[PDB]
A paper describes a structure:
PbdA is a member of the CYP199A family, which appears to have evolved to O-demethylate p-MBAs. Atomic-resolution structures of PbdA in complex with p-MBA, p-ethylbenzoate, and veratrate revealed a cluster of three residues that form hydrogen bonds with the substrates’ carboxylate: Ser87, Ser237, and Arg84. Similar to the substrate-bound structures of CYP199A2 and CYP1994, all three structures were in a closed conformation, with the F and G helices occluding the substrate access channel.
PbdA had the highest affinity (Kd = 3.8 ± 0.6 μM) and apparent specificity (kcat/KM = 20,000 ± 3000 M-1 s-1) for p-MBA. The structure of the three complexes are very similar to each other (RMSD of 0.176–0.683 Å of αC) as well as to the other CYP199As (e.g., RMSD of PbdA·p-MBA with CYP199A4·p-MBA and CYP199A2·p-MBA is 0.989 Å and 0.883 Å, respectively). The ordered water is localized by hydrogen bonding by heteroatoms in Arg236 and Ser237 side chains. The high affinity and specificity of PbdA for p-MBA is consistent with what has been reported for two members of CYP199A subfamily, A2, and A4, (18).
Author numbering: 8 to 400
The structure:
Amino acid sequence: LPVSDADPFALDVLQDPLPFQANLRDAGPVVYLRRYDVFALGRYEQVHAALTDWQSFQSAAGVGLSNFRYETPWRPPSILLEADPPHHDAPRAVLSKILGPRALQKLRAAWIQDAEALVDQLLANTTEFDAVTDLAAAFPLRVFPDAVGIPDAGRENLLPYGDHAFNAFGPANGLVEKGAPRVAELSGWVNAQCARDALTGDGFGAQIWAAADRGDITYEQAPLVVRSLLTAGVDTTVNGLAAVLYAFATHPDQWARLRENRTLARTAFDEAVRWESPVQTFFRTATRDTEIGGATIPDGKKILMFLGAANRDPRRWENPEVFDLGRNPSGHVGYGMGIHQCVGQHVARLESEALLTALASRVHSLEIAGPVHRHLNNTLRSWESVPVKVRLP
Ligand code: HEM
Ligand SMILES: COc1ccc(C(=O)O)cc1
């Protein structure tokens, strides 16, 4: 069995994980990380197998490093992300209906419009700006908390709350331990936005509580289902949006292709999600001795699935390092796969469709205007700054 002292949460790897990914894939289907006592998977075949096989690889012992068999969770674990069937089934089906295609139809014209207002206002002021702060961060914060229906107070908690959650899936290293004094306040705030009386009458929050009225979920589940939205719903889309913007800023032919066919927006965003893989890793825990990639994972031990690695595995993807909207990215594991696969993907895509359409409407060409800067995180590939210069027609 290949065994390694590689630390996937070291600051150098988080800054640039592409060499670790390629070594993981090259070493074997399964690599034992001695540092953490887990089994790493980097190739698509095994990452796909592990994601779908919920019977062998459970989530309820936690999908971070931390094993809830023994360790105290930093918060009450997610009743979606960290629940197996049957407990998973009810809250899943509620979000699945609420965030599904049909349901989102009603928000499309609003979100297109908000995107056009954000872009018009930005462009009236500057032709050069940061795509992170001015676009990728700014647009989800305009539309998404409003669609959930939380109030305006404490909205500055959304990004740190998400950040901390994604960090907290990794080891108790400095990125988690620096977050840990501010947890109580961060948690205090989020719980407070999940109550029925904190939410507007019509948003996703409202609809979650309406599902509880019908007995789809309990009144005890209702706030934690809202909480999933406020953990997973913001940071991921910001980083997905910074990735596709960075890609278009770096790929003038691909930008022209979008401008020729605006219906390419959905597939543009999915290709960014494959190529960037905003969520890089998750854990599962083996329920039995299970054989994957030629290796036996003992009952009770954790696997580490490298989504980013699988999404650039050349066994599944031709020339994987390339961002190409010509590629069919369908089958990427950037949203996961099987019963836990991202229930917010219709939201992500509509966001990208709105923003991309607004941008392409006004912007002849786009380039990188300055150094790019990452924001380090144990689990989430985060962008801090993407300076861009746009040329108006
Ligand atoms: C680009 C954006 C996004 C990425 C890259 C992403 C990624 C993921 C991945 C990889 C999973 C699978 C978890 C696992 O298998 O253990 C997932 C699940 C989930 N995502 Fe997303 N996500 C994104 C956007 C969103 C949005 C906008 C929401 C808001 C609705 C959301 C809510 C969730 C929830 C609740 C789950 C857990 C579902 C379950 O366990 O059944 N995500 N996401
Ligand atoms: C993909 O990341 C997440 C993170 C948190 C949750 C949750 O809190 O429900 C779901 C998905």
